[PDB]
Every structure is written in structure tokens, then in C-alpha cells.
Amino acid sequence: PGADAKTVQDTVTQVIEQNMNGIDNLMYMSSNSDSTGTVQITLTFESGTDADIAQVQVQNKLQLAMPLLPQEVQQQGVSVEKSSSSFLMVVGVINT
Amino acid sequence: LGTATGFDFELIDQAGLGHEKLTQARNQLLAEAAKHPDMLTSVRPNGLEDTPQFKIDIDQEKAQALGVSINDINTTLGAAWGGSYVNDFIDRGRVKKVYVMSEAKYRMLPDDIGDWYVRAADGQMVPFSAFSSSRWEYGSPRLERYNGLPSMEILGQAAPGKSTGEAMELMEQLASKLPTGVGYDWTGMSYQERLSGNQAPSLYAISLIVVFLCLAALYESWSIPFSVMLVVPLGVIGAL
Amino acid sequence: MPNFFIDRPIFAWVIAIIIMLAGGLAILKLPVAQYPTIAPPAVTISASYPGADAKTVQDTVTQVIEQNMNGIDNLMYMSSNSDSTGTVQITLTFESGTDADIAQVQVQNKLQLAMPLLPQEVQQQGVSVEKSSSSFLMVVGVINTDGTMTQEDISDYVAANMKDAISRTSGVGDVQLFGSQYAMRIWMNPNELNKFQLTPVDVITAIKAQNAQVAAGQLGGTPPVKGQQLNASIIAQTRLTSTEEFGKILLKVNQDGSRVLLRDVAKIELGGENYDIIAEFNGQPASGLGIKLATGANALDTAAAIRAELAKMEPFFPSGLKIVYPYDTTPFVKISIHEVVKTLVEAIILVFLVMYLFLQNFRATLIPTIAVPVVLLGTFAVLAAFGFSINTLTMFGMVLAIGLLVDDAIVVVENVERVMAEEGLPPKEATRKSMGQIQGALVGIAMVLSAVFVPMAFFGGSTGAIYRQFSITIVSAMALSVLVALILTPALCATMLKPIKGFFGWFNRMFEKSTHHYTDSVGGILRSTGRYLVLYLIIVVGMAYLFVRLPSSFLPDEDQGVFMTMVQLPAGATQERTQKVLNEVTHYYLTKEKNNVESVFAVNGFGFAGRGQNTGIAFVSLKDWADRPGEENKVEAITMRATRAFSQIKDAMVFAFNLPAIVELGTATGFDFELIDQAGLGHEKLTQARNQLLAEAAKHPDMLTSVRPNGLEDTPQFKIDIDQEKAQALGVSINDINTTLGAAWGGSYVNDFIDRGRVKKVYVMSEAKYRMLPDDIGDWYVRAADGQMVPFSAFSSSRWEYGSPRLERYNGLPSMEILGQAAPGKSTGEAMELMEQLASKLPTGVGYDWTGMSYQERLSGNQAPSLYAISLIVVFLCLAALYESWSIPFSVMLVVPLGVIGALLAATFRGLTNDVYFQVGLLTTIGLSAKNAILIVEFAKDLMDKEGKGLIEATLDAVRMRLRPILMTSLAFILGVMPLVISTGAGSGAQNAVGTGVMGGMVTATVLAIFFVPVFFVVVRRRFSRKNEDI
Ligand SMILES: CCCCCCCCCCCCO[C@@H]1O[C@H](CO)[C@@H](O[C@H]2O[C@H](CO)[C@@H](O)[C@H](O)[C@H]2O)[C@H](O)[C@H]1O
Ligand SMILES: CCCCCCCCCCCCO[C@@H]1O[C@H](CO)[C@@H](O[C@H]2O[C@H](CO)[C@@H](O)[C@H](O)[C@H]2O)[C@H](O)[C@H]1O
Ligand SMILES: CCCCCCCCCCCCO[C@@H]1O[C@H](CO)[C@@H](O[C@H]2O[C@H](CO)[C@@H](O)[C@H](O)[C@H]2O)[C@H](O)[C@H]1O
Ligand SMILES: CCCCCCCCCC(=O)OC[C@H](CO)OC(=O)CCCCCCCCC
Ligand SMILES: NCc1cccc(-c2ccc3nc(N4CCNCC4)c(Cl)cc3c2)c1
Ligand SMILES: CCCCCCCCCCCCCC
Ligand SMILES: CCCCCCCCCCCC
Ligand SMILES: CCCCCCCCCCCC
Ligand SMILES: CCCCCCCCCCCC
Ligand SMILES: CCCCCCCCCC
Ligand SMILES: CCCCCCCC
Ligand SMILES: CCCCCCCC
Ligand SMILES: CCCCCCCC
Ligand SMILES: CCCCCCCC
Ligand SMILES: CCCCCC
Ligand SMILES: CCCCCC
């Protein structure tokens, strides 16, 4: 919260990236760090990779980098999720 | 998947050049690409351009002379203007966050900076103006990295009548004339198209070869298979 | 099928072509490896406690982690080292077949329970959990040929621009930097600090405050006021980027207004995170990456991926920077496999030639020549179906399978060319009835021979995959051979066979006469059978003696074009002395092994046991095998001479050693012992127990040899006692004291900075000159609550003591590893039994265990004899079915010793052992021997059943008929396996070994069979009969 893109990149993104080692079947890695205080790092794996194994291997390397991140980021936490743009539906909730 | 039409290019800082030099190299590539409308169309960055930002320097000597700690200064600035997640409370049985932040009207403009006071060790309240200075500068609102290195993603597509493969060839030729230390890579759909294309010739060959061999066994003849295999264009022409 | 394809030769070709296409596509995609995977997965936890001694590491990190290691599936044992570089390594070794991904997940799930209990300094160094082999796959070296970059510069360039992408590459399980990345080094001066009434605590506090990256929010940020037109990020402090900026950190302002800057109390420079690892390439400054193969990953695919990634970096190198390749285990794999391919081709050509010699017709010879490639290519497709790899044993299966299937088509082609001579049927008509006579026996005999190898496919243990893949390859090839002989061969016999001197005339007539004296000799032997019965038994007793006389091993050492040299100095020795020893090692290879050594990559400060000022390693790469003729230019003799030369180096343990085929199984005669503190005795008592055990072992040179500890000896350490009362009285904080002491003498990782775009570390530490001497301790001052500067001498006392630089634990208890081996002639089992006896007489509370290779030894015992018994039983049963007789099978079984004797003869005279390759050749010999015997019995019995000829007439008519075709196929294969025997170059150790046993077994199985088989048949039928034969 409140961080600029360079602060995010240089205290969070680079640290996490430098720890994404020893993971199997990685094709490439990409990231953005932005002025809303957000970073997203996406690791893309070979077709046929077990997505659960890929995610736990990523999550476990991340876990061991958490002590290197700023306290404010440790407090917010860092989420690791399987990526997917396919929604079954979007339920809207409005007040009339 | 995305549009999966066009190409997906990564410009890469391979030698610690820095954001500004990478931007210059990007612009060089975009300008050259614009000189080949016959081959490339809508070659553009996928990210954001640098914007004005408000650089505030804390004067350490003045802070120390007044007895104001840097931690109080930076917490006061960050908590008021950026907001701060303090801890959690429990709202109707559900754990939720507590945030402190300035009310909107006291964190809008540079003149508001001087309305925020920090208590020194001797109890006196000191305004931010007394130990800071500011200036406008440019910086990035969105920094990109690719395989751990600074990068800028560039999207585009082949011009009408041209194949994406040909457009990729030119992009690579143009990229080879960029300043020292600037590399590139293909990602996404473009990574996908290169690998699928490298397989196609051998898969066609295996299909053609096995079809011939099955027919040769069927007819006990190395030549009669051809009379069947010649039919291929007859359907294809009407589909086209 | 035969009659079907005789009418459809193009269909036959189509099936052969599809078989070959599938095999060809398998060859392009199958994994390539030296051996099948047999090594158990190992997960290693690594952590670092900067400035910590071994006991501090053990008692605040290692024990905490170990106590959380529970509920982990398939765990065989756990071991750990805690050392006075501040490093701990904990290795968990799992059962063969364990999924390394799950083992890593399970280990980490438990580690995360321990992580919060670990010191913050340890957490912030980064704890790592890796799943990799223990040995290096390769070392990637980096030099600067223009000499414009120092060792430190190159190391930082590798760390900052190369290492991470290599570390992310799939199959790379671990990467060691031979060097260090740059950090911002603040080298504190205690005199200047005291002059300004400052301490390392103030320095650290000021760096955290003035090397900061501050989140400051936005102008016009959300939620905004109405009418806002400006939105912009606020940028406050950012990480410092240069020594200049660190130098002007403001520590304080004096009363008179003067400023104290960090550069007034410290020297500030870019320099390594650590200064322990310094490498050279052929004496020149270097860095590099030591790469370990991830568990179960393919070595060749991973090396290829590493090279492709390195190729992406090279264009952006600074001037002069160059990648060198001083140590790579993978070329040997690739080249050794290609050499077996070459001998496979050469074996096929040598078969084609020996047949043209006997057949004397290209057409008649070509049909067999076409069948073998079709079958072998198809066997590759079967390997893919079974999920096997192209490796040494599947490739030896390809070569040795030839001898057991080459007769399939020959029996078909010849039984046709005979039908066209007896009668006058055309080639097509003859093939049909010909196939009707042999088709059934072909299938059935292939099943009898398959019985030889099927049992061995059920071999257990880690060793089991070796015998399994070989057996499957042999059986698959024989099965495909039958199929090809029922599909392609009949079609070619019916389309190509020509309807039915010189050197050949000379050959034919020579053989004609030889056949005459042969049949004559046979008839004479039939009348003197009693004598030759006795001769047979002593062949069986001789075979028995040579079998027990022959020593046994697992896999021969191979010259792999590379090897390593270990440098171990006593703890307490300095970096400077280790470099002196490394210079001597490097000098020796560059001056005394000019003809053999291509490069030396020497690393000061790195060993396999662990880091330290007192340890180093030299990686040595040799010139190509072709440029190193003779055994004196092979790795074994090179390392022997080197170790002998290095024995004259004082105060150091230096030895060159070859890589073992399988590091896991390790030495052929070595053991791996663990002495265990079972009762909280403590390190000093355990050391004494160790010494007692080491002394008693020396008293038995008869059975034990080189029984030594694997770890390090105690060394002097500087014990300093902080006096709590004096510190309280002076108002000196214990936290200030410990931070001042640890930061100055051990170093402290303060926070991060940005060096040319890359996040890196900042370290404070005393400048070297103020942390070299015990007296320097009192030059460090701490500030009390009342502002007075207090020297360490005012509140501390010190004394010398002894302590351990490397504490070992095994399965969670204090331990000491002891290596050793059996004395000449003695067996490892005998040596281990003695060690157990000696261990039982040790002080109360001292226990023991076996690990590593010795865990495998006691675990998997001898299981080959039972499987050989099963094979023989099943072969006999299959023969009983083939001949519908319980007795006739013995006429074939009795030929097995005639072949086994030759394989033992050859292995003995040539000096080989009873290893993997002698056993796969021994099974092949059994099958080849039975095969040759059936090439006689099947015909001798065919006349007594179809031509009604008597026992003695049928026997002598068959041998005369079969002497030529038998010696044809037999000598062809004997010559065919010649390239295995005379093999030199990569993998020649395995080739020579497997060839010697098989060829030796073929020779005896061929010369003795043509004389003894007639005796076996006639004697067996006479005994087990009533009113049938002899007329
Ligand atoms: C009748 C001729 C034999 C058949 C021809 C060979 C068929 C193809 C064999 C497999 C592919 C080539 O592999 C064959 O073995 C190795 C491959 O490293 C080469 O061997 C050569 O180079 C290697 C290193 O590369 C040296 O260690 C070796 O001393 C030298 O002989 C042979 O020159 C090559 O012919
Ligand atoms: C019966 C006589 C014939 C017996 C012949 C047996 C030869 C077996 C030797 C193969 C050993 C080397 O195995 C080697 O593996 C690599 C890595 O997959 C293959 O590498 C291949 O990759 C791709 C597909 O994977 C191919 O498009 C490419 O042309 C080739 O480089 C080699 O083409 C193959 O030669
Ligand atoms: C797991 C349990 C199953 C495993 C069983 C092991 C079976 C092993 C069989 C060994 C081989 C048997 O080999 C078989 O022997 C018989 C003996 O009559 C031969 O002889 C037979 O040939 C054919 C078979 O249809 C008949 O027309 C003929 O009259 C008969 O003599 C066969 O041609 C041969 O194929
Ligand atoms: C004139 C040529 C027409 C080719 C049309 C192919 C369009 C499909 C492309 C595709 O998805 O590729 C899949 C696959 C690759 O092996 O396609 C093919 O294999 C196409 C070739 C099959 C036809 C040859 C047999 C002759 C008929 C008896
Ligand atoms: N029973 C009539 C009869 C009359 C005359 C001859 C054969 C004959 C047929 C096929 C044979 N197939 C054999 N092997 C070689 C090794 N591979 C498996 C198969 C061997 Cl050893 C002997 C063989 C005898 C059969
Ligand atoms: C791989 C293609 C094989 C084709 C073989 C053609 C048949 C054999 C040659 C013709 C034989 C007739 C001459 C007597
Ligand atoms: C798809 C590959 C087929 C190649 C074989 C051509 C057949 C030869 C024609 C003439 C035979 C009489
Ligand atoms: C446990 C190992 C299984 C053994 C497989 C059976 C061996 C014969 C297979 C032949 C394949 C054609
Ligand atoms: C028509 C028969 C074709 C199958 C040939 C089988 C050869 C023996 C295989 C042994 C399996 C254990
Ligand atoms: C003789 C061919 C045997 C079947 C080949 C099928 C290929 C299996 C790939 C997994
Ligand atoms: C791969 C197809 C080979 C067929 C050629 C036969 C021509 C006589
Ligand atoms: C581990 C699976 C083995 C598959 C065997 C296939 C038999 C042809
Ligand atoms: C471990 C026992 C295996 C025995 C294999 C038997 C095959 C018929
Ligand atoms: C293994 C069983 C053999 C039994 C032979 C019986 C002879 C009549
Ligand atoms: C009747 C024989 C057909 C076999 C095809 C594989
Ligand atoms: C006619 C039987 C076919 C067998 C193929 C494996």
C-alpha cells in the first residue's frame, strides 16, 4: 500500500524473481510492478506440466523468500494462484 | 487465450542499461517498424509511458538538528498520503483490516505537505516544509520484467497479405540494429507459433508417408496408391 | 501369416518399413543416459548463519530443523553437518522410486514449522530446499581473455547476469557460484568510531534509515476530493546505488556543527558478499557455475538446455569475457553411447561378411542382412513402449541379441534352398512348404531361449533396473525376430532367391575334408563315450573352481575424460596456505601431464564436505581418449601418479580420484560407517570413542585398510566471557555488546541496495586489519547509557580452548562418519563384520550404523543364484514341451557348462571380475549355448522321427549336415562381438568386459558342442528308452 512502481519492483519483485530457482518445467517468467502498489509475476510452464506441482513448487520457493520482503508486504501477504481467464459466469450485485 | 493474432515481442535490458536507455531503444525500434507499413501494422508498446512524479527529499542534517527521527518522518508521510494497514478487528464475527490514512482534503496537492507536523524529541511540532524539498521529475507507473531482466513488451501484427512469420523476421532484423546491451525474445502466442511451426513439416511427412504405405499394402502395389492420393486437391478447391 | 505374405511381398515390406519408421522415431526421441536411474532421491536443506561457529549453528539451527523432520514418507536416513563457516546442510535420503517432487514438498512442509524458530539472521540469508545429485554435472567456467576484469569482477558479473537464468533452467537442481556476488561493503574502523563516540550499532541504524525505499503514496490519490485535476506518485527516499552515496550517510552532527559521514569511520567499496571462494582456470583468474543435476533429470537434455541459455547471454558479454568448459560429465555419456552404436554397426557388417563367406551369394546373404536391422530398429520402438532409455545396457542388448536371432532367417532361407535342391520346386512354391516345416519350431525355440532371460527381468533392488532393461531388450528382439521371420523373410525367399572355383573352391574343399575328419572323429567318440563322460565332469568342476575363484564387483570404473582432486588442510589453516597447495596441484598438471591434461579449474575455499579456508578442489579435464593411447595415459594411472606426487605435500591431504560409475553404490570394497552418541555423551567423549575405534582398526591390517574419519579435528578457539555485572554497572547494554562484537568480527547483513539495476546486499564488518589479532578485541568500544565509551576489555575476559569446526549428526544424533575398506583379498562383508565387533567394545552410550553404500550392501544381498536356478528350471520345462519328453531336454541342458567355462576362462585370463557385465554376458552365454545345441538336436531327432533312421546314424548324419551352418552363425557372432573386445575409447571398459565373457563363452560353446552334443543326445536316449532306437 502506497508504494510506487520502482519501490515495488526493487523491494518485492526482484527479490521474488531471484528466488524462482529449482522449479521444474518453467518456460519463462514475466512481471509488472506498478504505481498502485501491486506486483504480478507470472510463471508459464511447459504444456503437460502438472499445474498443482508447478504451483506448489512456486509457492514453496516464495515461502522461503518471505523473510526478505518488506514488513508491510509480509503483512498484506503474497498470493500464489493458478492463472485462468475463463469465467463460467459473472454475478453482479447492485443496489437500486 | 488472448486474441492470438499478431506477435508478442519482448525488448530486454541485457546489460544494466536502465529504464531510460531501454525506453530510448524501444522508441528506436517502434520508429523503424513504422517505416515498414507493408510488413508491420500497429506495432505498439503494451505498457505505460513515464509520467510526472513528485520527488521529495528529506534533509537528514536538518532532521537531526531539530531532533526529528527519520522513522517518524517517513511513517507520517507514508501513513497519511499512502495509507497504512495497522492490524485487524472483528466485524460481526469476521476478521477485517484496519487502515489509517489522511482524509482526502489534506493529501491532494503539494501545498498540503506542509500541513503535516512531526513531533521532535524535545516536544516541538515541526512542519514537513522545515526539513524537506521537492521537485517534479518523470518516472514509470508500470515497470516490466521478463525472465528476471528489465523488459518492454511490444505487440503488433503482420500487414495485410503478409504472414506473421515474415513480420517476425523483420522485427528480428530491426532488433539486431539496436544499441549495445539490448536484446529481445518472443513470448506468448509467438513462442507458441514458432514451436508449432517447427513440428508441422515432419507431421505432414509422417501422414503422407503412412498413407502411401497403407495404400501400397491394400493394393499390393507401389504405384496404384498414387491414383487415390491424387484426389486431395478436388475437395480442397471447392472448400477454398 | 507365412503363406499370406508369400503372396503379398509388398505388404511384407510395408510392415518392415513401418517397424523401422517407428524405431527411427523412437531413436530421435528416446532419452539417452549411461545407465537406468538407480540412485535414491536426496533432498538437502541448506542454511547460513553469518559469523556463527559450528556449535552455534548446530544448537540454534540444525537441531531445531531436525526435530521437525518427522512423518516423511520413504525416508531412509538423515545426516547433517554444522560448521564454523556458519553453514548447515541437512540431507534426507529416500527409497529408490520415491517421487522427488513429493519428497521435497514433504520436507518443506516440516521445515516451514521450524522456520519461525530460527534466528532472523538465518532466515534473511535464505534457507533453501533442493532435490539434486550430490556430484557436479558440469562446471561452467568464465574468464576474461583481455585480462580487463579481476576474479572479483568476473564473479559478480556471473552472479548478476548469468546465474539466475541457469538456476531457473529445468533439470538444474543446484548451482554453486565459484566466487561471490558484489555487496556494498562498509569496512568499519574502530579508532574513528570511538573518536566520534559511535559504534557499529549507530552505523547499522543509520544505514537502515538512509538506505531506505519509502512508500509515500500519491498526490490526488483515491479516494480523492471533488474537482481534483492532479494525480502523481510521491517519490521519497530510494535505495542508494553507489559507494559515493553510502559514503555521505550522515551519522551525526557535532556540537560545533561539523558533520560525521560514514566515510569518516569506514572504507566503502563494492566487494563480495563473502571472500571465501576464489577460482582459477589454467592459472588465470576465473569464476564459474558448478551445476548439479535435479533428481531424475536427464543429464544430456539438461546440458543442452544449459548451453542454449548460455548462448543467449554471450552476445551481451563485456569485452574479453569468455565461457570455458573445464569439467563436463556429459560428453562421456554421449560419446560412450555413440561408440556402442559404432560397434553395433560394425557387428552387423562383420556378420554380413562371414555369411557371404559361407553362402557365397549376395542374394542368399542379403535376406538375413535385411532382417537384423529391421528387428533391431523395431526393438527401439519397444524400448519407448516400455518407457526405457537408450543406455549402455539396452545398447549391449542390441548387440548381443544378434547372436540369438540371426539364425531365424538363416534357418528359413536355407531350409528353402534345400527344398529347391532336393525337389525342383520354384522359389515361391518351396517357401510355402518350407515355412510349414520350421514355422512351429521357430516360435517354440524362441520361447525356450526367452526363458533364459525372463526371470532376470524380475531382479530387485536398485541394481534391478540394470538387469531388467537388458533382459527386456533381448527378449523383445527375439520376439520381433520371429515376427520378421514369419512375414518378411518368407516374402523375400519367394521373390529374390535364385531358383535352384577360386578362393571359395579352396574354402569349400578345405571344409569338405574337415567335415569328413569331423564326422569320423564323432563316430569314434560315440564308441568311447565312457571316457568323454569323465572329461565332462572335470569341465564342470573346473567351471565350479573358476567361478568361486573369480572376484565380484558391480560396475567397472570408466575413464570419462575428467576427474577431481581433493585438497584438505587441517582446520585452522589459512586461505593463503590452501592456495599454496592448490598452486602445487595446478603446477603438476600443467607441467607433468602436458600430454594428458587439457585444463585445470581450481577452487580455493570450496570442498564437497563443506566450505572453509582450509579446503579446495581442482577439476581436471583431459584430452580426447584418442590422444591418450595406452593405459598409462588413462584416468586410473593419471590419478595414481598424481596422488603419489602429492603425497609429499606437507600438512595437507591431497589426492586425485576417478568418478565411480555409480557414486551411490560407491567403492567395490569400501564401507561407510557412522559412530553415534546414543546417550548424550558429548563431542569430546565421542571423539575419544572414535579414536579408540580407529586405533583398534589399525591393529588389523589383515582385514581393514585406510579406516579414517571423514570430518575435521578440533582446533583452538577464542572464548570470550561477557561479565554481566560489570556491563550492568557501567550501563552497557548486552545487545550493544553482542552487535558490536558480531558485526565487527563476523559481519552483518544490514539491508539491500541497487547495483546497476539489480538488488544486492549491504554488509558492515570490521576492516581486515582490526579483526586479525586477539589484542584487537580491546580496540572496540561500546557506548554506555551515560554516553561514555567503554572498551571491550572493561567488561570481558578471554581464554583459549578447543572446539569443533564441523559437527556431524546422523538420524538426529551426534555422529562421526568413518570411511574404510576391506584389505586385499578380504570381502566387504568380512570387513564390516569386524567393524561391528570392534564397535561392540566401545564405551557405554556409543552406538553405530551403516549408511550410503554400506546401507545398500546390507539391504540388497545376493539374489542372482536363485534367479539362475529359476531360469534353468524354466528352460528345461520349455524344452520338455518342445520335445514332448522329460529326458531329451537334458541333451540341450548339459551344453550350458561348455559355454560357461569359456566365459569364466576369458574373464579370468584377462583379469576381469564377476560384475554386471559378466552376468549379462553369462546369461547370453547360457542362451547361446542352448541355441547351438538345439541346432544339432532338432535335426538329429528330426531324422529318427521323420526319416526313421537309427540313433547313431541320425546323430552322425545331423552333425555332418549341421557342422557348416552351425560354424557359420557361431563364427559370425564371435567375429561380430570382436569390436567389443578390441574396443578403445569412451566406454571401452564396459565394452571390453561384456565382450570378453560372451566371446570366450561362444568359443568353448562352439568347439566343444560339435563334439559333446552328439554324445549328450546318444547317451540320454540310450538311458531313457525301451524298444525304439538303435535300429
Ligand atoms: C564401418 C564403419 C563404422 C560405422 C560408421 C559409424 C556409424 C555411426 C556411429 C555413430 C555415430 C558416429 O559416432 C562414431 O563414434 C564416435 C562418436 O563420438 C567418433 O569417435 C571419434 O570421436 C570421438 C569423440 O567425438 C573420440 O573420442 C574417438 O576416439 C574418435 O574415434 C567416431 O568417429 C564416429 O564415427
Ligand atoms: C540397427 C542399426 C541402427 C541402430 C541405430 C541406433 C542409433 C541410436 C543412437 C541414438 C543416440 C543419440 O540419440 C540422439 O538423441 C537426440 C536427443 O533426442 C536426438 O536429437 C534430435 O532431436 C530432434 C528430435 O528429438 C531431431 O529433430 C533432431 O534432428 C536431432 O537432433 C538425436 O537425433 C539422436 O541421435
Ligand atoms: C505362463 C504359463 C504359460 C507358459 C507356458 C510355456 C510354454 C512353452 C512352450 C515351449 C514351446 C512349445 O513349442 C511347441 O512344441 C511343439 C511340440 O509338439 C511343436 O510341435 C507341434 O507343432 C504344431 C503346433 O501347432 C503341431 O501342429 C504339431 O503337430 C506339434 O508337433 C510346436 O511346433 C512348438 O511350437
Ligand atoms: C493440398 C494439401 C491439403 C492439406 C490440407 C491440410 C489442412 C489441415 C492442417 C492440419 O491441421 O494439419 C494436421 C495434419 C498434419 O499432419 O494434416 C495432414 O497430415 C494433412 C495431410 C493429409 C493428406 C494426405 C493423405 C492423402 C489422402 C489419401
Ligand atoms: N522340427 C522340424 C525342423 C527341422 C529342421 C529344422 C528345424 C528348425 C526350425 C527353426 C529353428 N529355429 C531355431 N532358432 C534359432 C535361434 N532363434 C530362435 C529359433 C533353432 Cl536354434 C533351430 C531351429 C530348427 C525344425
Ligand atoms: C525399402 C523398399 C524395398 C523394395 C524392394 C523391392 C523388391 C525386391 C527387388 C525385386 C526382386 C525381383 C528380382 C529377382
Ligand atoms: C510418399 C513416399 C512414396 C515414395 C515411393 C514411390 C513409389 C515408386 C513408384 C514406382 C514403383 C513401380
Ligand atoms: C517386473 C518386470 C516385468 C517383466 C516383463 C516380462 C518380460 C517379457 C516381456 C517381453 C516383451 C516382448
Ligand atoms: C505367431 C507368433 C508370433 C509371436 C512370436 C513369439 C516369440 C516368443 C516371445 C517370448 C515371450 C515371452
Ligand atoms: C514394434 C513397435 C511396437 C509398438 C510401438 C508403439 C510406440 C509406443 C510409444 C509410447
Ligand atoms: C518409403 C517408401 C518406399 C517405397 C519404394 C519402393 C519402390 C520400388
Ligand atoms: C511402466 C509401464 C510399462 C508399459 C509396458 C508396455 C508393454 C509393451
Ligand atoms: C523376486 C522373484 C521373481 C521371480 C520371477 C519368476 C518368473 C517366472
Ligand atoms: C519336473 C517334473 C518332472 C517329472 C518327470 C516324471 C517322469 C515320468
Ligand atoms: C492372415 C494373415 C494376416 C496377418 C496380418 C498381420
Ligand atoms: C496372425 C496373428 C498375428 C499376431 C501379431 C502379433
Side-chain angles (χ1 to χ4, degrees), chain C residues 873 876-877 886-887:
Chain C
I873 293 156
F876 166 83
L877 294 163
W886 295 113
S887 69

Side-chain angles (χ1 to χ4, degrees), chain C residues 382 386 453-454 457-459 468 471-472 475-477 479-480:
Chain C
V382 176
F386 275 98
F453 304 92
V454 161
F458 296 86
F459 205 109
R468 195 191 342 290
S471 276
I472 301 295
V475 172
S476 297
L480 287 174

Side-chain angles (χ1 to χ4, degrees), chain C residues 725-784:
Chain C
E725 188 178 353
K726 195 56 167 153
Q728 286 180 25
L730 294 165
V732 172
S733 152
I734 297 293
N735 285 337
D736 287 354
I737 291 170
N738 289 143
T739 293
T740 297
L741 182 64
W745 297 76
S748 178
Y749 173 23
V750 175
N751 59 8
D752 297 325
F753 82 114
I754 308 294
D755 181 29
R756 294 165 279 164
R758 185 179 168 88
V759 60
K760 295 181 182 175
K761 301 188 181 69
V762 183
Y763 276 95
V764 301
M765 198 170 182
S766 173
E767 193 192 334
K769 60 165 55 158
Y770 306 105
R771 49 172 174 78
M772 289 293 109
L773 306 175
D775 272 347
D776 294 339
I777 293 281
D779 296 346
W780 285 94
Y781 291 70
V782 185
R783 190 174 60 254

Side-chain angles (χ1 to χ4, degrees), chain B residues 58-60 63-64 68-75, chain C residues 209-210 237:
Chain B
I58 302 292
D59 191 72
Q60 301 291 332
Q64 289 181 23
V68 174
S69 72
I70 311 298
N71 307 83
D72 288 347
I73 290 165
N74 283 328
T75 296
Chain C
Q210 294 176 52
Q237 281 172 257

